[PDB]
Structure formats: structure tokens, C-alpha cells
Amino acid sequence: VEYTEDDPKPQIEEDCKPHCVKEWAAYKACAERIKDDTTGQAHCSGQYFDFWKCVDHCAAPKIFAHLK
Amino acid sequence: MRWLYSTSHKDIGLLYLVFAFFGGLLGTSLSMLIRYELALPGRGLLDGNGQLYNVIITGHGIIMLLFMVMPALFGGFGNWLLPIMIGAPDMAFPRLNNISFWLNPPALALLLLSTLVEQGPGTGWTAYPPLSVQHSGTSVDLAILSLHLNGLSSILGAVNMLVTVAGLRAPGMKLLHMPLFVWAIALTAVLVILAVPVLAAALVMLLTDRNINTAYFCESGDLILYQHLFWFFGHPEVYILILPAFGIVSQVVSFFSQKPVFGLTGMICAMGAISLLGFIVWAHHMFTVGLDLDTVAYFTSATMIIAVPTGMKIFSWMATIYSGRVWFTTPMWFAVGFICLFTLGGVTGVVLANAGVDMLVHDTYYVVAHFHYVLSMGAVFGIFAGVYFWGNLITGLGYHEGRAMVHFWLLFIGVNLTFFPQHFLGLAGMPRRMFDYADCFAGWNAVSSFGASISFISVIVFATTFQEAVRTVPRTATTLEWVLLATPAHHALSQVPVLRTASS
Amino acid sequence: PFKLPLDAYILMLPITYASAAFVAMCCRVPTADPETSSIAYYEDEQKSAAAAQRYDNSFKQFFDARIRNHKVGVFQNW
Amino acid sequence: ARAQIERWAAEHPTAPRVGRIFEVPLGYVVPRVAAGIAAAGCLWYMNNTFLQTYRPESLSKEFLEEQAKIGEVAQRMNAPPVYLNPFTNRIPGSILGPEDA
Numbered sequence: 001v002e003y004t005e006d007d008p009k010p011q012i013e014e015d016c017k018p019h020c021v022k023e024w025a026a027y028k029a030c031a032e033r034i035k036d037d038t039t040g041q042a043h044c045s046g047q048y049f050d051f052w053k054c055v056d057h058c059a060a061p062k063i064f065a066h067l068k
Numbered sequence: 069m070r071w072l073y074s075t076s077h078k079d080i081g082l083l084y085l086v087f088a089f090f091g092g093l094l095g096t097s098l099s100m101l102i103r104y105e106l107a108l109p110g111r112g113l114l115d116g117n118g119q120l121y122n123v124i125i126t127g128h129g130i131i132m133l134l135f136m137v138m139p140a141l142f143g144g145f146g147n148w149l150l151p152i153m154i155g156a157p158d159m160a161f162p163r164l165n166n167i168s169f170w171l172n173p174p175a176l177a178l179l180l181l182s183t184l185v186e187q188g189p190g191t192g193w194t195a196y197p198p199l200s201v202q203h204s205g206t207s208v209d210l211a212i213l214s215l216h217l218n219g220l221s222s223i224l225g226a227v228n229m230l231v232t233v234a235g236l237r238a239p240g241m242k243l244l245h246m247p248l249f250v251w252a253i254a255l256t257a258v259l260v261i262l263a264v265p266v267l268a269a270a271l272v273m274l275l276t277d278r279n280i281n282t283a284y285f286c287e288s289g290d291l292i293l294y295q296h297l298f299w300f301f302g303h304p305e306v307y308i309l310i311l312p313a314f315g316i317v318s319q320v321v322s323f324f325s326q327k328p329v330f331g332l333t334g335m336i337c338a339m340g341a342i343s344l345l346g347f348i349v350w351a352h353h354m355f356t357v358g359l360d361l362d363t364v365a366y367f368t369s370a371t372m373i374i375a376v377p378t379g380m381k382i383f384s385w386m387a388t389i390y391s392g393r394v395w396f397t398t399p400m401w402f403a404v405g406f407i408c409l410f411t412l413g414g415v416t417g418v419v420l421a422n423a424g425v426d427m428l429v430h431d432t433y434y435v436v437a438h439f440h441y442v443l444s445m446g447a448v449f450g451i452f453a454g455v456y457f458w459g460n461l462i463t464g465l466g467y468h469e470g471r472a473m474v475h476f477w478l479l480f481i482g483v484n485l486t487f488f489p490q491h492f493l494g495l496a497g498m499p500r501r502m503f504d505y506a507d508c509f510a511g512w513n514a515v516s517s518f519g520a521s522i523s524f525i526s527v528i529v530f531a532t533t534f535q536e537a538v539r540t541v542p543r544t545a546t547t548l549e550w551v552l553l554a555t556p557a558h559h560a561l562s563q564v565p566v567l568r569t570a571s572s
Numbered sequence: 573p574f575k576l577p578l579d580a581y582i583l584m585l586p587i588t589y590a591s592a593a594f595v596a597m598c599c600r601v602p603t604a605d606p607e608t609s610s611i612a613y614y615e616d617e618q619k620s621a622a623a624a625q626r627y628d629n630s631f632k633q634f635f636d637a638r639i640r641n642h643k644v645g646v647f648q649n650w
Numbered sequence: 651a652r653a654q655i656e657r658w659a660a661e662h663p664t665a666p667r668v669g670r671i672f673e674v675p676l677g678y679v680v681p682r683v684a685a686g687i688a689a690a691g692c693l694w695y696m697n698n699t700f701l702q703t704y705r706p707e708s709l710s711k712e713f714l715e716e717q718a719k720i721g722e723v724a725q726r727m728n729a730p731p732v733y734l735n736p737f738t739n740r741i742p743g744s745i746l747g748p749e750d751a
């Protein structure tokens with residue numbers, strides 16, 4: 001495995017993104033659902049966490065394969 | 069000469085059994101091509117020939133329905149066992165009993181010869197028009213003439229059975245003392261006589277449409293009328309093939325439990341109620357053809373009532389084993405396996421009887437799994453139960469017990485792992501009568517094709533079970549065929565036995 | 573042939589029900605809308621609409637209130 | 651009812667009566683049913699290996715990787731694409747497809 005000067009982790013994270021499409025759909029549904037909230041007390045942290053947990057679980061062994 | 073000119077019911081029953089074994093070998097061979105083509109997505113050993121696949125499934129379905137189960141149960145065990153069981157010295161019409169057999173090798177030869185003519189009869193075993201009419205050539209006519217000859221065989225056999233029961237009974241023996249095998253065979257004969265000529269009429273209509281340019285099922289005719297007539301035959305047909313299995317299971321269960329049958333009059337009333345309700349529910353094979361909602365409503369409500377007598381029979385078999393002195397041999401396992409695995413096939417029939425649910429699973433492999441449960445666990449287990457039970461009485465050879473249990477376990481493993489994944493395929497939406505499927509259906513088809521090889525190997529091992537027999541002297545029994553020697557003489561019951569009621 | 577056991581009458585109630593339903597179904601078909609061997613039957617629109625709506629309503633009007641109530645299951649799945 | 655059982659047992663002397671439910675010992679049954687399953691597996695493997703004339707191109711590994719990149723997404727020619735089977739894959743009702751997400 002060759003080692004490069006630029007970061008492979010964003011590219012690997014982009015490559016693992018089609019594997020978690022249902023989580024991204026749920027996050028987008030949350031983001032469009034809370035667009036009418038005026039109280040300032042509505043976020044989308046849970047769906048964001050689910051999506052990024054799926055992406056990290058995909059991408060964890062591939063990053064250290066590219067790292068010395 | 070002996071096997072060509074025979075008038076004895078015991079030689080004719082053995083000839084039926086050997087013929088049914090040959091038909092079972094043919095349908096086993098035709099079924100390894102079905103499972104070897106369907107193992108993987110794409111094109112297999114048939115090289116993408118869909119007409120040849122349709123020919124293979126049509127011939128295989130017809131052979132296993134009509135030249136294996138009926139010649140084994142109705143013609144094989146009934147002819148050998150009925151006059152000995154009721155005490156008759158012979159059949160009522162001994163030469164009619166020989167033409168009832170000898171119309172079957174011509175029908176098998178016509179059916180096997182239709183495959184080598186033109187492109188063959190790829191229509192399904194039901195042979196629906198206008199697909200059956202559209203076939204150009206000779207193959208479909210040979211297939212329908214084969215069905216006509218087999219129907220004539222069945223009608224002649226049923227007439228001989230019905231006259232042998234009613235008029236050659238032993239002195240003192242009324243319609244209360246006959247075993248349940250006799251009652252099952254008599255009710256099967258009544259069903260055959262009432263049901264087969266409607267099929268014969270529909271097939272004559274099919275020939276006149278094909279070859280005489282008539283207007284039965286055509287442009288100006290009605291194609292739903294064929295489905296009406298064919299299924300008015302065909303739903304009694306599946307009960308014709310399962311009632312002698314019920315009789316064999318009753319005789320086997322009562323024997324090794326050292327007990328008489330629980331609820332004899334309830335058993336007879338249940339078999340009669342099954343025989344009567346089989347003639348008014350034929351249109352559950354036609355939920356998707358566009359019938360009116362009231363007709364579909366009736367045929368939904370009347371089909372589920374068949375569950376009650378069958379459940380009564382199963383519970384009475386369990387009560388017969390209950391509080392007995394049970395010894396488990398190879399025929400006893402094939403009966404226990406029957407009662408366990410017929411229940412699994414029967415409960416899916418209740419699901420299919422509901423019409424709204426049937427709109428999702430019609431012509432899928434769910435139906436295939438249902439009817440391979442009630443036929444490969446219902447009739448094949450009943451046939452093999454009788455082969456090990458009466459075999460030294462019929463053939464003069466005993467069987468090795470260890471290899472028979474090896475054969476039973478190989479068969480039981482093979483047919484369960486073949487048709488249980490087909491439930492999941494049919495629920496997901498995999499359609500019938502197709503040799504190529506979507507990519508996602510690959511796993512359960514691989515599992516089912518693995519199971520069919522185990523079933524084939526089980527068929528191979530069965531030929532090794534036979535060995536030499538040991539002969540003893542009988543004194544007493546509860547049925548007449550167990551006080552006879554093994555094998556009996558040519559004229560069994562040299563003196564006619566009588567039944568004496570006890571005095572006061 | 574024998575004494576009918578106490579089971580056999582409990583069997584015979586839905587068997588009689590199925591036979592009566594079969595006879596009524598076969599009998600009501602020659603009193604239906606599409607069983608007319610003429611084209612001049614449909615040129616009287618009042619009588620034909622009345623006959624065909626009567627063919628719709630019978631054996632379905634028993635189920636209208638539970639079709640509207642979605643009583644399509646044994647349980648209550650929402 | 652007992653004498654016919656005792657007659658059947660005399661004409662079938664290879665059937666054991668040793669006081670247990672499985673009269674034939676399982677040390678006889680298990681290796682032989684294992685050998686039968688092994689022969690069946692050999693036949694099934696021979697069908698999978700030497701009896702195929704067309705293996706479709708949607709089962710090749712390049713197709714499988716390119717399909718796994720897309721997922722269960724169906725395109726439309728009059729509308730944005732849509733997630734297939736939104737209940738068993740638990741897509742929420744606000745999201746219809748990936749591009750509209």
C-alpha cells in the first residue's frame with residue numbers, strides 16, 4: 001500500500017456513503033420536517049449520528065489499511 | 069403367460085405396484101432436470117429451451133399424479149388387499165380387473181411418445197386452452213388420449229371395487245366390521261365414478277376444438293368453461309389420491325399401538341364428509357379468472373369446512389396412539405411422519421382457501437410447496453408405509469431394518485429441505501412454471517436443489533433394503549391378512565371365513 | 573349402516589349450510605343481469621339498472637357497514 | 651392384537667426390540683445418512699460447475715460492486731429516483747429518494 005501526502009480519510013468516507021442511504025434519507029426527512037420550527041429547540045442530531053455511525057463502521061478498517 | 073393372462077387379484081395388484089414403481093422412477097428422473105435447471109439464475113443444462121422445460125414439467129406432473137400414486141394405492145394395495153380383507157374369494161369381475169390394468173401401459177406409452185413428437189406438449193398438467201389448442205401437430209392429442217385411457221382404467225377399476233365390496237362380503241360381516249382401508253377404497257371408487265367422466269367430456273371438447281374446428285373454447289366460445297369442467301374433475305382427483313393413504317395410516321397406527329382405532333364411526337363420517345364436500349368447492353383454483361364476487365365468496369366460505377373432518381381424523385390417529393403399547397418400526401415412522409407433515413401441508417391450504425390472500429400467492433411456488441407437502445408427505449409416505457408393512461405378505465421378501473431407517477431419514481431430510489424454502493420464494497413473489505428467475509431468488513433455489521439430490525439418493529438406497537424372509541405360523545389377528553401365510557396360496561381363503569356374533 | 577355419532581350432526585350443520593349456499597348460488601345465476609340472450613334487454617335502462625343494482629346489493633349489503641369500518645381482520649391492526 | 655405383533659416380529663428378525671425409541675442404533679444411522687448427504691452434495695456441485703451454459707453478467711463482481719454502490723435505488727423517467735421497499739429498509743416518510751433527500 002502506497003502512502004501519500006494528502007488525506008485518504010475524506011475519500012474513503014465518501015466511498016462508504018452509498019452504503020448508508022436509508023440513514024441519509026431519514027436525516028434529510030428530519031431536516032425538511034423541522035424547517036418550520038421557530039422556537040430554536042429542534043435539531044436533527046440523532047439521525048445525523050446514525051448516518052455517521054454507519055459511515056464510520058464502514059470506513060474504519062479501510063483508513064488504517066491506507067495508513068502507516 | 070402368468071403375468072399376461074392373469075385373473076387373480078393378487079397378481080394384478082403386484083403388477084400395479086411394479087408399474088407404479090416404474091412411474092415413480094420416471095417422475096424422479098424428470099424432476100432432477102427441473103431442479104438442476106432451477107439451481108442457478110440464467111440458463112442451465114436445458115440451454116435456454118423453454119418449450120422443453122414446459123414439456124418436462126407437464127410430463128412430470130401428469131406422470132406423478134396419475135401413473136405413480138393411483139397405481140400404487142388404488143390399484144396396487146386395493147386390488148391385493150380388498151378381497152382378503154372383506155373375505156371375498158376373488159373380485160366380482162376378474163377379467164375386467166385385468167383390462168383395468170392393461171389400459172395403463174398403452175397410456176404411459178402414448179404420454180412418453182408425445183415427448184418425441186414435434187416440440188412436445190408443453191402446456192402444464194392442466195392443459196389450458198388456447199395454449200393447448202395453439203400447439204400445432206400431434207403431441208397434445210397423444211397426451212389427451214393418454215389421459216382418456218387412464219380415466220377409462222380408473223372407471224373400470226372403481227366399478228369392480230364397488231361391486232366387490234357390496235356383494236362378496238363374508239357371511240355375518242356387515243358394513244361395521246370392515247377395516248377403514250376398505251371404507252377408504254370404497255369412497256375412492258365412488259369419487260372416481262362421479263368425477264372422471266366430467267374430465268372425459270372436457271377432453272373430448274378439447275379434441276373437437278383442436279381438430280374439428282368446433283366452438284367450445286375458442287374465439288366465439290368460453291374459455292372459463294374449460295376451467296370449470298377440469299377443476300370439477302380435479303378437486304375430487306386430489307382426494308382420490310389421499311384416502312387410501314388415510315386407510316393405510318389407520319391400519320399401520322392401529323397395528324403397532326396394540327389398540328383398535330379411536331372413533332370408528334367418526335372416522336367413517338369424516339371420510340364421507342370429505343368425499344361429499346370435495347364436489348362443491350372446485351372453483352378455488354379459479355380465484356384470478358374474473359368470477360363474480362358472490363361466487364368467489366361462496367367458494368371461499370365452503371373450502372375451509374374441509375379442515376374440520378381432516379382435523380378429526382388426525383386427532384383420532386393421535387388418540388389411537390394415545391394410551392397404547394407403541395413399538396416404533398419403519399412403517400410406524402412413515403405414519404408418524406405422515407401425521408406430522410400432512411398437517412403442515414393442510415394448514416397452507418386454509419390460507420390458500422381465503423380468496424383475498426390467494427390474490428397474492430396464486431401461481432407462485434407457495435402453491436407448489438403446499439401440494440408437495442400434501443403429496444410427497446401424504447401419499448408417498450403412505451405408499452412407503454405399506455411397502456414395509458405388508459411387503460413379506462405380498463412379495464415374499466423381508467427387508468433389512470437398518471437400511472430402511474437410512475432410507476427413511478435420507479428421504480425425510482431430502483423432501484423437507486426441498487419444499488420448505490419454496491414457501492419463502494412464493495411469499496416473496498416467485499412465479500410458477502418458469503426456468504429463469506430474478507437474481508435475488510438464488511439462495512432458496514440453491515437450498516431446494518441441494519435437497520432434491522438428497523431425495524434422489526434416498527430413492528437409490530431403497531433398492532438395497534430387500535433381503536430374504538423368515539416364515540412362521542399364524543394363529544390369531546385382528547384382520548384377515550395376518551392369519552394367512554407369507555406368501556398366501558393362489559386361492560387365498562380356500563374356505564370362506566364367517567363372522568360369528570357371540571350368543572347370550 | 574351404523575349409529576350416527578354425536579360428532580356427525582355437528583359436521584352436518586355447516587355441510588347443510590354449504591349445500592344450501594351452493595343451491596342458492598346456482599339458482600340465482602339465471603336471475604342475473606348478464607344472463608340475457610338479447611341486445612334489446614339493455615335498451616330499457618331503468619329496468620336493467622334496477623336489476624343489476626339488485627344483483628349487486630344482495631349478499632353484499634350484509635357487509636357494507638364493516639367494509640366502511642374496515643373490519644377486514646380478526647384483530648384490529650390500526 | 652398382541653399375537654399379530656409377535657408374528658410380525660418373528661418375520662422381521664432384523665427389527666430390534668431393545669427398549670428404546672430409536673431401535674436401530676444411531677451409530678449405524680448417522681454415518682450412512684452422512685455418506686448419502688455427501689454423495690448428494692457431490693452431485694449438486696457437479697451440476698453447479700460443469701452443467702451451465704450461460705452465467706448472466708449481473709452476477710459478476712464488477713456488476714455487484716457497482717450495484718452495491720447504488721443500493722436499492724430505482725430511477726424514474728418522469729420524476730426523481732426513489733428508494734425501493736421503504737418499510738423493510740426503514741426509510742422515513744419525509745424522504746422519498748436519495749436525490750430528493
Ligand code: HEA
Nearest residue numbers: 088089092099125126129132140192193443500501502520
Ligand atoms: C405425486 C405427485 C408428485 C411427487 C411425488 C412429486 C415429487 C417431486 N417434485 Fe413435483 N410436481 C407435481 C407432483 C409431484 N411431484 C405436479 C402435479 C406438478 C405440476 C406440473 C405442472 O405445473 O404442470 C409438479 C411440478 C414440480 C415443480 C414445479 C415446477 C415449476 O413450477 O416449474 C417442482 C419444483 O421444484 C417439482 C420438484 C419435485 C421434487 C424435487 C420431487 C421429489 O420428491 C422427487 C420424488 C421422490 C420421491 C421419493 C417420490 C417418488 C415416489 C416413489 C418412487 C414411490 C413409488 C414406489 C413404489 C410404488 C414401491 N415438481
Ligand code: HEA
Nearest residue numbers: 306352374375378379414415417418420421430435439442
Ligand atoms: C394430496 C392432494 C391434495 C390434498 C389432500 C389437498 C388438500 C387441500 N387443499 Fe389443495 N392442491 C393440490 C392437492 C391437494 N390439496 C394440488 C395438486 C394443487 C395445485 C393444482 C394445480 O396444479 O394448479 C392444490 C391447490 C390448492 C388450491 C388452489 C390455490 C391455487 O392454486 O391458487 C386451494 C384453494 O383453496 C387448496 C386448498 C386445500 C385445502 C383447504 C385442503 C384441505 O383438504 C386440507 C385440510 C387439512 C388441514 C386444514 C390440516 C388438518 C386440520 C387440523 C389439524 C385441524 C385444525 C385446522 C384448523 C382449525 C383450520 N389447495
Ligand SMILES: [Cu+2]
Nearest residue numbers: 303306352353
Ligand atoms: Cu383443490
